[PDB]
Amino acid sequence: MGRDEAGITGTWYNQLGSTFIVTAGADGALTGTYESAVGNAESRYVLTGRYDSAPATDGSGTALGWTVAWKNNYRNAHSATTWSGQYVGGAEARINTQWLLTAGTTEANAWKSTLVGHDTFTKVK
Amino acid sequence: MGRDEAGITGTWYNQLGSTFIVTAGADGALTGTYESAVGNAESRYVLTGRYDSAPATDGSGTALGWTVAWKNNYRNAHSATTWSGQYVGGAEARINTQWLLTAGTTEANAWKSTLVGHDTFTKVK
Amino acid sequence: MGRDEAGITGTWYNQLGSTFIVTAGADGALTGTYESAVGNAESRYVLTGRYDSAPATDGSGTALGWTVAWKNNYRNAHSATTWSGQYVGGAEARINTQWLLTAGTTEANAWKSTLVGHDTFTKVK
Amino acid sequence: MGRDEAGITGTWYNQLGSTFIVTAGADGALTGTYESAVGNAESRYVLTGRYDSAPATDGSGTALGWTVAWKNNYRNAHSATTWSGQYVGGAEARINTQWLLTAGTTEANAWKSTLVGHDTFTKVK
Ligand SMILES: [Cu+2]
Ligand SMILES: [Cu+2]
Ligand SMILES: [Cu+2]
Ligand SMILES: [Cu+2]
């Protein structure tokens, strides 16, 4: 019932070799799992997020975002990443994102708490 | 059952006068509503996110993040914000965040799709 | 000859206790020194940057930015910070910035190369 | 006399078709011109910046950054971009950056003052 519900739902892979498994709900919900190929991470982590379920029809992408807190049954990296981006449909469908990864720190170390980067997700690798 | 479940759960206010209403689950879930005092927004929007439910005990903050897609029954701003940050407990409890706000754009306009900023949330105003 | 040449030129202090000493040129140049109160840094480092020497007259701030590479005669932290922001004049003059601090890394570690934060500079402390 | 003085100096092109012309000084200076293929920009703009003139010899990139204020003899976009990144040498030499583009705004509009993105520069197109 959301415009790109089918387009977004499924398995995505980024340039680092990480795996993003998501279900898009009719209501705008994103739920799934994230497995990072890098960093202080092992196996799957819960993710949740939101997307625009009624995007513009003028060729614009579909805005979305999601969060992973880096705690699961195996490890806790005392940190959380949020990806903010847009889904672009078509033959080479993509989710183009920028992300913010904040670590829990002391107040004295808060200036160095947050990494920033960019991930591009595709349906194939 | 999460360490800062009680600390995080409730109503928070930022420097712009926005209102963030959240429930923290034992499992690491964040669910609630966001009302922005600024921008192309009216009333409450659904949010979801994650937090570290077993933070370090060395005085470090608690990593968390959440997403709002700016669609509700009143408006659709074809955009999504993610906040990434940490909760700092104590007498003047705070959630210190940085955020990324991505708009759905054409591919030609994607270079100007994403705003970045920083919000500090407190329990009082 | 630039509108805020006099306003910008001088000594500024941020929330971390760092010291930013700058001269604004008529042509839009920023030159000076930066001393960080935190991180892998000691004493003064060269900075250079640019500002809008003919800002809007509608109450808007003055856009500017500058760079420090963290090499001087004492230390080399193999990294560079850029601050991007605006100068806001008046009785409590401020330079409000966001910054990106990139470390030289191997290609395998490039995903974790860049910190992001925000500094507010004032004329007094 | 700087390790990558020769490597950095010259003409670079990004994924948008913008042109970055830079001279790297022995002392860590970057000077040159920037021509954007997009946005409120026409012709060349002055840039200045800094780079690590004595990088690590362990295969790490070379940290650098620079600023453009978007005022020249043709236009004034009341804004400034800073790029923060690293130079990676070799057969396919690259400068991989993230950037912050701040517009001069009123205090009421400062929350929406800053765009963030990422540019990759190469020696060929
Ligand atoms: Cu619409
Ligand atoms: Cu631990
Ligand atoms: Cu004007
Ligand atoms: Cu070294």
Side-chain angles (χ1 to χ4, degrees):
Chain A
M1 181 172 93
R3 174 58 183 81
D4 311 296
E5 189 172 350
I8 293 167
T9 294
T11 302
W12 295 87
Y13 308 92
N14 75 11
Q15 77 292 341
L16 300 168
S18 301
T19 305
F20 167 49
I21 291 170
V22 67
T23 299
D27 58 352
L30 300 176
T31 62
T33 63
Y34 201 97
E35 183 169 3
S36 185
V38 301
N40 189 9
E42 147 185 11
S43 196
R44 290 169 305 287
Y45 294 82
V46 173
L47 70 90
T48 186
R50 302 291 295 169
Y51 76 106
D52 179 3
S53 57
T57 59
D58 63 358
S60 296
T62 300
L64 80 183
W66 70 93
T67 306
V68 169
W70 298 104
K71 176 181 181 297
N72 67 9
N73 289 343
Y74 302 100
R75 297 201 198 182
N76 192 349
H78 302 308
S79 53
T81 303
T82 63
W83 290 256
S84 181
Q86 58 184 317
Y87 162 88
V88 179
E92 296 220 305
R94 297 196 137 45
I95 302 171
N96 295 320
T97 74
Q98 296 185 91
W99 51 257
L100 297 169
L101 178 183
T102 308
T105 68
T106 58
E107 291 198 273
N109 294 327
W111 71 273
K112 57 176 178 176
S113 69
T114 314
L115 292 171
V116 60
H118 48 94
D119 287 353
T120 301
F121 297 86
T122 59
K123 296 293 299 170
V124 29
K125 255 211 312 309
Chain B
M1 181 172 93
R3 174 58 183 81
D4 311 296
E5 189 172 350
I8 293 167
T9 294
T11 302
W12 295 87
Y13 308 92
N14 75 11
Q15 77 292 341
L16 300 168
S18 301
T19 305
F20 167 49
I21 291 170
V22 67
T23 299
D27 58 352
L30 300 176
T31 62
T33 63
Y34 201 97
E35 183 169 3
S36 185
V38 301
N40 189 9
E42 147 185 11
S43 196
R44 290 169 305 287
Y45 294 82
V46 173
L47 70 90
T48 186
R50 302 291 295 169
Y51 76 106
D52 179 3
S53 57
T57 59
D58 63 358
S60 296
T62 300
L64 80 183
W66 70 93
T67 306
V68 169
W70 298 104
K71 176 181 181 297
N72 67 9
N73 289 343
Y74 302 100
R75 297 201 198 182
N76 192 349
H78 302 308
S79 53
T81 303
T82 63
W83 290 256
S84 181
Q86 58 184 317
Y87 162 88
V88 179
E92 296 220 305
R94 297 196 137 45
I95 302 171
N96 295 320
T97 74
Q98 296 185 91
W99 51 257
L100 297 169
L101 178 183
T102 308
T105 68
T106 58
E107 291 198 273
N109 294 327
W111 71 273
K112 57 176 178 176
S113 69
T114 314
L115 292 171
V116 60
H118 48 94
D119 287 353
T120 301
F121 297 86
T122 59
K123 296 293 299 170
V124 29
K125 255 211 312 309
Chain C
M1 181 172 93
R3 174 58 183 81
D4 311 296
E5 189 172 350
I8 293 167
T9 294
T11 302
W12 295 87
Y13 308 92
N14 75 11
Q15 77 292 341
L16 300 168
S18 301
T19 305
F20 167 49
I21 291 170
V22 67
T23 299
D27 58 352
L30 300 176
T31 62
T33 63
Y34 201 97
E35 183 169 3
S36 185
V38 301
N40 189 9
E42 147 185 11
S43 196
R44 290 169 305 287
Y45 294 82
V46 173
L47 70 90
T48 186
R50 302 291 295 169
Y51 76 106
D52 179 3
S53 57
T57 59
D58 63 358
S60 296
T62 300
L64 80 183
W66 70 93
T67 306
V68 169
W70 298 104
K71 176 181 181 297
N72 67 9
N73 289 343
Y74 302 100
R75 297 201 198 182
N76 192 349
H78 302 308
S79 53
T81 303
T82 63
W83 290 256
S84 181
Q86 58 184 317
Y87 162 88
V88 179
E92 296 220 305
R94 297 196 137 45
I95 302 171
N96 295 320
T97 74
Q98 296 185 91
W99 51 257
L100 297 169
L101 178 183
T102 308
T105 68
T106 58
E107 291 198 273
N109 294 327
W111 71 273
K112 57 176 178 176
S113 69
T114 314
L115 292 171
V116 60
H118 48 94
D119 287 353
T120 301
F121 297 86
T122 59
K123 296 293 299 170
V124 29
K125 255 211 312 309
Chain D
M1 181 172 93
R3 174 58 183 81
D4 311 296
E5 189 172 350
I8 293 167
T9 294
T11 302
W12 295 87
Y13 308 92
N14 75 11
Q15 77 292 341
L16 300 168
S18 301
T19 305
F20 167 49
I21 291 170
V22 67
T23 299
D27 58 352
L30 300 176
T31 62
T33 63
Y34 201 97
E35 183 169 3
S36 185
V38 301
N40 189 9
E42 147 185 11
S43 196
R44 290 169 305 287
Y45 294 82
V46 173
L47 70 90
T48 186
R50 302 291 295 169
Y51 76 106
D52 179 3
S53 57
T57 59
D58 63 358
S60 296
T62 300
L64 80 183
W66 70 93
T67 306
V68 169
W70 298 104
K71 176 181 181 297
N72 67 9
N73 289 343
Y74 302 100
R75 297 201 198 182
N76 192 349
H78 302 308
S79 53
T81 303
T82 63
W83 290 256
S84 181
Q86 58 184 317
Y87 162 88
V88 179
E92 296 220 305
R94 297 196 137 45
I95 302 171
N96 295 320
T97 74
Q98 296 185 91
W99 51 257
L100 297 169
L101 178 183
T102 308
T105 68
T106 58
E107 291 198 273
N109 294 327
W111 71 273
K112 57 176 178 176
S113 69
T114 314
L115 292 171
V116 60
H118 48 94
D119 287 353
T120 301
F121 297 86
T122 59
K123 296 293 299 170
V124 29
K125 255 211 312 309

PDB file of all heavy atoms in Angstrom, chain A residues 97-120:
ATOM      1  N   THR A  97      22.787   6.901   1.159  1.00  0.00           N
ATOM      2  CA  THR A  97      22.723   7.388   2.529  1.00  0.00           C
ATOM      3  C   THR A  97      23.967   8.152   2.977  1.00  0.00           C
ATOM      4  O   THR A  97      25.069   8.012   2.432  1.00  0.00           O
ATOM      5  CB  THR A  97      22.539   6.249   3.539  1.00  0.00           C
ATOM      6  OG1 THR A  97      23.768   5.515   3.680  1.00  0.00           O
ATOM      7  CG2 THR A  97      21.396   5.300   3.138  1.00  0.00           C
ATOM      8  N   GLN A  98      23.747   8.959   4.005  1.00  0.00           N
ATOM      9  CA  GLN A  98      24.805   9.464   4.872  1.00  0.00           C
ATOM     10  C   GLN A  98      24.476   8.969   6.279  1.00  0.00           C
ATOM     11  O   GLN A  98      23.306   8.697   6.600  1.00  0.00           O
ATOM     12  CB  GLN A  98      24.917  10.990   4.771  1.00  0.00           C
ATOM     13  CG  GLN A  98      25.333  11.401   3.366  1.00  0.00           C
ATOM     14  CD  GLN A  98      25.595  12.875   3.200  1.00  0.00           C
ATOM     15  OE1 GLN A  98      26.711  13.334   3.376  1.00  0.00           O
ATOM     16  NE2 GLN A  98      24.568  13.625   2.801  1.00  0.00           N
ATOM     17  N   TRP A  99      25.510   8.749   7.099  1.00  0.00           N
ATOM     18  CA  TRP A  99      25.275   8.196   8.430  1.00  0.00           C
ATOM     19  C   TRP A  99      26.055   8.897   9.515  1.00  0.00           C
ATOM     20  O   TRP A  99      27.077   9.532   9.245  1.00  0.00           O
ATOM     21  CB  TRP A  99      25.548   6.679   8.466  1.00  0.00           C
ATOM     22  CG  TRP A  99      26.888   6.206   7.914  1.00  0.00           C
ATOM     23  CD1 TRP A  99      27.118   5.611   6.703  1.00  0.00           C
ATOM     24  CD2 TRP A  99      28.144   6.217   8.597  1.00  0.00           C
ATOM     25  NE1 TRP A  99      28.445   5.285   6.580  1.00  0.00           N
ATOM     26  CE2 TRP A  99      29.098   5.659   7.727  1.00  0.00           C
ATOM     27  CE3 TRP A  99      28.564   6.692   9.852  1.00  0.00           C
ATOM     28  CZ2 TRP A  99      30.444   5.515   8.089  1.00  0.00           C
ATOM     29  CZ3 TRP A  99      29.899   6.541  10.215  1.00  0.00           C
ATOM     30  CH2 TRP A  99      30.826   5.999   9.317  1.00  0.00           C
ATOM     31  N   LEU A 100      25.540   8.766  10.734  1.00  0.00           N
ATOM     32  CA  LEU A 100      26.166   9.285  11.953  1.00  0.00           C
ATOM     33  C   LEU A 100      26.254   8.148  12.963  1.00  0.00           C
ATOM     34  O   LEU A 100      25.228   7.556  13.335  1.00  0.00           O
ATOM     35  CB  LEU A 100      25.353  10.418  12.580  1.00  0.00           C
ATOM     36  CG  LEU A 100      25.160  11.704  11.797  1.00  0.00           C
ATOM     37  CD1 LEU A 100      24.124  12.553  12.499  1.00  0.00           C
ATOM     38  CD2 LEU A 100      26.479  12.442  11.652  1.00  0.00           C
ATOM     39  N   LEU A 101      27.475   7.852  13.399  1.00  0.00           N
ATOM     40  CA  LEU A 101      27.759   6.786  14.363  1.00  0.00           C
ATOM     41  C   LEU A 101      28.277   7.405  15.664  1.00  0.00           C
ATOM     42  O   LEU A 101      29.422   7.853  15.733  1.00  0.00           O
ATOM     43  CB  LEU A 101      28.777   5.816  13.767  1.00  0.00           C
ATOM     44  CG  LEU A 101      29.292   4.631  14.594  1.00  0.00           C
ATOM     45  CD1 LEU A 101      30.344   3.907  13.767  1.00  0.00           C
ATOM     46  CD2 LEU A 101      29.863   5.062  15.928  1.00  0.00           C
ATOM     47  N   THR A 102      27.418   7.449  16.681  1.00  0.00           N
ATOM     48  CA  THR A 102      27.759   8.039  17.985  1.00  0.00           C
ATOM     49  C   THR A 102      28.110   6.941  18.986  1.00  0.00           C
ATOM     50  O   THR A 102      27.349   5.958  19.132  1.00  0.00           O
ATOM     51  CB  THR A 102      26.610   8.864  18.544  1.00  0.00           C
ATOM     52  OG1 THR A 102      26.170   9.806  17.558  1.00  0.00           O
ATOM     53  CG2 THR A 102      27.039   9.622  19.798  1.00  0.00           C
ATOM     54  N   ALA A 103      29.245   7.107  19.661  1.00  0.00           N
ATOM     55  CA  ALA A 103      29.656   6.224  20.740  1.00  0.00           C
ATOM     56  C   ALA A 103      29.253   6.855  22.060  1.00  0.00           C
ATOM     57  O   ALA A 103      29.297   8.070  22.200  1.00  0.00           O
ATOM     58  CB  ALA A 103      31.147   6.044  20.709  1.00  0.00           C
ATOM     59  N   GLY A 104      28.877   6.033  23.038  1.00  0.00           N
ATOM     60  CA  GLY A 104      28.768   6.522  24.406  1.00  0.00           C
ATOM     61  C   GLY A 104      30.152   6.928  24.904  1.00  0.00           C
ATOM     62  O   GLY A 104      31.091   6.128  24.831  1.00  0.00           O
ATOM     63  N   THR A 105      30.287   8.157  25.401  1.00  0.00           N
ATOM     64  CA  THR A 105      31.558   8.681  25.905  1.00  0.00           C
ATOM     65  C   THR A 105      31.349   9.416  27.221  1.00  0.00           C
ATOM     66  O   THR A 105      30.231   9.792  27.563  1.00  0.00           O
ATOM     67  CB  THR A 105      32.218   9.698  24.945  1.00  0.00           C
ATOM     68  OG1 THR A 105      31.437  10.901  24.875  1.00  0.00           O
ATOM     69  CG2 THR A 105      32.385   9.122  23.538  1.00  0.00           C
ATOM     70  N   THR A 106      32.449   9.665  27.929  1.00  0.00           N
ATOM     71  CA  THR A 106      32.433  10.642  29.008  1.00  0.00           C
ATOM     72  C   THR A 106      32.191  12.029  28.415  1.00  0.00           C
ATOM     73  O   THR A 106      32.397  12.267  27.207  1.00  0.00           O
ATOM     74  CB  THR A 106      33.757  10.658  29.789  1.00  0.00           C
ATOM     75  OG1 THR A 106      34.825  10.955  28.883  1.00  0.00           O
ATOM     76  CG2 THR A 106      34.000   9.301  30.456  1.00  0.00           C
ATOM     77  N   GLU A 107      31.763  12.953  29.263  1.00  0.00           N
ATOM     78  CA  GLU A 107      31.534  14.321  28.825  1.00  0.00           C
ATOM     79  C   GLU A 107      32.825  14.942  28.266  1.00  0.00           C
ATOM     80  O   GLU A 107      32.781  15.615  27.244  1.00  0.00           O
ATOM     81  CB  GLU A 107      30.891  15.152  29.945  1.00  0.00           C
ATOM     82  CG  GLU A 107      29.454  14.698  30.217  1.00  0.00           C
ATOM     83  CD  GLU A 107      28.616  15.709  30.978  1.00  0.00           C
ATOM     84  OE1 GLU A 107      28.654  15.700  32.227  1.00  0.00           O
ATOM     85  OE2 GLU A 107      27.889  16.490  30.322  1.00  0.00           O
ATOM     86  N   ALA A 108      33.969  14.632  28.880  1.00  0.00           N
ATOM     87  CA  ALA A 108      35.276  15.121  28.412  1.00  0.00           C
ATOM     88  C   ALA A 108      35.646  14.630  27.005  1.00  0.00           C
ATOM     89  O   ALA A 108      36.384  15.309  26.284  1.00  0.00           O
ATOM     90  CB  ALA A 108      36.375  14.737  29.401  1.00  0.00           C
ATOM     91  N   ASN A 109      35.142  13.455  26.622  1.00  0.00           N
ATOM     92  CA  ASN A 109      35.418  12.880  25.296  1.00  0.00           C
ATOM     93  C   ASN A 109      34.286  13.040  24.263  1.00  0.00           C
ATOM     94  O   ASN A 109      34.384  12.506  23.162  1.00  0.00           O
ATOM     95  CB  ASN A 109      35.782  11.401  25.437  1.00  0.00           C
ATOM     96  CG  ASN A 109      37.088  11.194  26.176  1.00  0.00           C
ATOM     97  OD1 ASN A 109      38.011  12.006  26.073  1.00  0.00           O
ATOM     98  ND2 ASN A 109      37.174  10.108  26.921  1.00  0.00           N
ATOM     99  N   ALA A 110      33.240  13.777  24.603  1.00  0.00           N
ATOM    100  CA  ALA A 110      32.076  13.915  23.728  1.00  0.00           C
ATOM    101  C   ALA A 110      32.400  14.589  22.405  1.00  0.00           C
ATOM    102  O   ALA A 110      31.798  14.249  21.380  1.00  0.00           O
ATOM    103  CB  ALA A 110      30.937  14.631  24.441  1.00  0.00           C
ATOM    104  N   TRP A 111      33.391  15.481  22.391  1.00  0.00           N
ATOM    105  CA  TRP A 111      33.806  16.113  21.132  1.00  0.00           C
ATOM    106  C   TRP A 111      34.230  15.104  20.056  1.00  0.00           C
ATOM    107  O   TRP A 111      34.116  15.399  18.874  1.00  0.00           O
ATOM    108  CB  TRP A 111      34.930  17.141  21.347  1.00  0.00           C
ATOM    109  CG  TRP A 111      36.244  16.520  21.693  1.00  0.00           C
ATOM    110  CD1 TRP A 111      36.696  16.189  22.939  1.00  0.00           C
ATOM    111  CD2 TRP A 111      37.274  16.137  20.781  1.00  0.00           C
ATOM    112  NE1 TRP A 111      37.935  15.634  22.859  1.00  0.00           N
ATOM    113  CE2 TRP A 111      38.324  15.585  21.549  1.00  0.00           C
ATOM    114  CE3 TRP A 111      37.417  16.207  19.389  1.00  0.00           C
ATOM    115  CZ2 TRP A 111      39.505  15.113  20.975  1.00  0.00           C
ATOM    116  CZ3 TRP A 111      38.593  15.740  18.819  1.00  0.00           C
ATOM    117  CH2 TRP A 111      39.622  15.184  19.617  1.00  0.00           C
ATOM    118  N   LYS A 112      34.754  13.943  20.480  1.00  0.00           N
ATOM    119  CA  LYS A 112      35.190  12.873  19.563  1.00  0.00           C
ATOM    120  C   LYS A 112      34.249  11.657  19.585  1.00  0.00           C
ATOM    121  O   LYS A 112      34.665  10.531  19.301  1.00  0.00           O
ATOM    122  CB  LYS A 112      36.646  12.471  19.848  1.00  0.00           C
ATOM    123  CG  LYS A 112      36.941  12.008  21.253  1.00  0.00           C
ATOM    124  CD  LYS A 112      38.379  11.551  21.366  1.00  0.00           C
ATOM    125  CE  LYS A 112      38.664  11.139  22.788  1.00  0.00           C
ATOM    126  NZ  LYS A 112      40.029  10.590  22.935  1.00  0.00           N
ATOM    127  N   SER A 113      32.973  11.894  19.883  1.00  0.00           N
ATOM    128  CA  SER A 113      31.991  10.811  19.981  1.00  0.00           C
ATOM    129  C   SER A 113      31.386  10.320  18.658  1.00  0.00           C
ATOM    130  O   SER A 113      30.833   9.213  18.626  1.00  0.00           O
ATOM    131  CB  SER A 113      30.832  11.247  20.885  1.00  0.00           C
ATOM    132  OG  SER A 113      30.076  12.271  20.251  1.00  0.00           O
ATOM    133  N   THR A 114      31.416  11.147  17.610  1.00  0.00           N
ATOM    134  CA  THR A 114      30.594  10.911  16.431  1.00  0.00           C
ATOM    135  C   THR A 114      31.375  10.860  15.113  1.00  0.00           C
ATOM    136  O   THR A 114      32.047  11.820  14.729  1.00  0.00           O
ATOM    137  CB  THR A 114      29.482  11.966  16.299  1.00  0.00           C
ATOM    138  OG1 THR A 114      28.845  12.138  17.571  1.00  0.00           O
ATOM    139  CG2 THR A 114      28.417  11.519  15.264  1.00  0.00           C
ATOM    140  N   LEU A 115      31.281   9.706  14.453  1.00  0.00           N
ATOM    141  CA  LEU A 115      31.791   9.500  13.104  1.00  0.00           C
ATOM    142  C   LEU A 115      30.688   9.823  12.100  1.00  0.00           C
ATOM    143  O   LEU A 115      29.505   9.607  12.381  1.00  0.00           O
ATOM    144  CB  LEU A 115      32.243   8.059  12.907  1.00  0.00           C
ATOM    145  CG  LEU A 115      33.466   7.606  13.689  1.00  0.00           C
ATOM    146  CD1 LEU A 115      33.619   6.112  13.548  1.00  0.00           C
ATOM    147  CD2 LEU A 115      34.721   8.286  13.180  1.00  0.00           C
ATOM    148  N   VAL A 116      31.098  10.259  10.908  1.00  0.00           N
ATOM    149  CA  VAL A 116      30.195  10.520   9.794  1.00  0.00           C
ATOM    150  C   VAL A 116      30.747   9.848   8.548  1.00  0.00           C
ATOM    151  O   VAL A 116      31.961   9.835   8.322  1.00  0.00           O
ATOM    152  CB  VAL A 116      29.990  12.034   9.556  1.00  0.00           C
ATOM    153  CG1 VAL A 116      31.301  12.764   9.223  1.00  0.00           C
ATOM    154  CG2 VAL A 116      28.932  12.297   8.486  1.00  0.00           C
ATOM    155  N   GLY A 117      29.831   9.295   7.754  1.00  0.00           N
ATOM    156  CA  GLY A 117      30.193   8.703   6.490  1.00  0.00           C
ATOM    157  C   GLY A 117      29.022   8.580   5.546  1.00  0.00           C
ATOM    158  O   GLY A 117      27.960   9.157   5.767  1.00  0.00           O
ATOM    159  N   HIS A 118      29.233   7.819   4.479  1.00  0.00           N
ATOM    160  CA  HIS A 118      28.215   7.649   3.458  1.00  0.00           C
ATOM    161  C   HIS A 118      28.274   6.236   2.914  1.00  0.00           C
ATOM    162  O   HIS A 118      29.367   5.740   2.613  1.00  0.00           O
ATOM    163  CB  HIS A 118      28.380   8.689   2.354  1.00  0.00           C
ATOM    164  CG  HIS A 118      29.779   8.815   1.840  1.00  0.00           C
ATOM    165  ND1 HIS A 118      30.228   8.125   0.736  1.00  0.00           N
ATOM    166  CD2 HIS A 118      30.833   9.540   2.283  1.00  0.00           C
ATOM    167  CE1 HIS A 118      31.497   8.422   0.514  1.00  0.00           C
ATOM    168  NE2 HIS A 118      31.891   9.279   1.438  1.00  0.00           N
ATOM    169  N   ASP A 119      27.101   5.594   2.843  1.00  0.00           N
ATOM    170  CA  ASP A 119      26.941   4.232   2.311  1.00  0.00           C
ATOM    171  C   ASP A 119      25.967   4.246   1.142  1.00  0.00           C
ATOM    172  O   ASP A 119      24.931   4.912   1.192  1.00  0.00           O
ATOM    173  CB  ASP A 119      26.373   3.280   3.383  1.00  0.00           C
ATOM    174  CG  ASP A 119      27.372   2.902   4.481  1.00  0.00           C
ATOM    175  OD1 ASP A 119      28.574   3.253   4.395  1.00  0.00           O
ATOM    176  OD2 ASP A 119      26.881   2.277   5.454  1.00  0.00           O
ATOM    177  N   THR A 120      26.297   3.505   0.085  1.00  0.00           N
ATOM    178  CA  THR A 120      25.380   3.293  -1.020  1.00  0.00           C
ATOM    179  C   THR A 120      25.016   1.821  -1.029  1.00  0.00           C
ATOM    180  O   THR A 120      25.904   0.966  -1.046  1.00  0.00           O
ATOM    181  CB  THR A 120      25.996   3.686  -2.363  1.00  0.00           C
ATOM    182  OG1 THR A 120      26.357   5.070  -2.323  1.00  0.00           O
ATOM    183  CG2 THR A 120      24.989   3.467  -3.488  1.00  0.00           C
TER     184      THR A 120
END
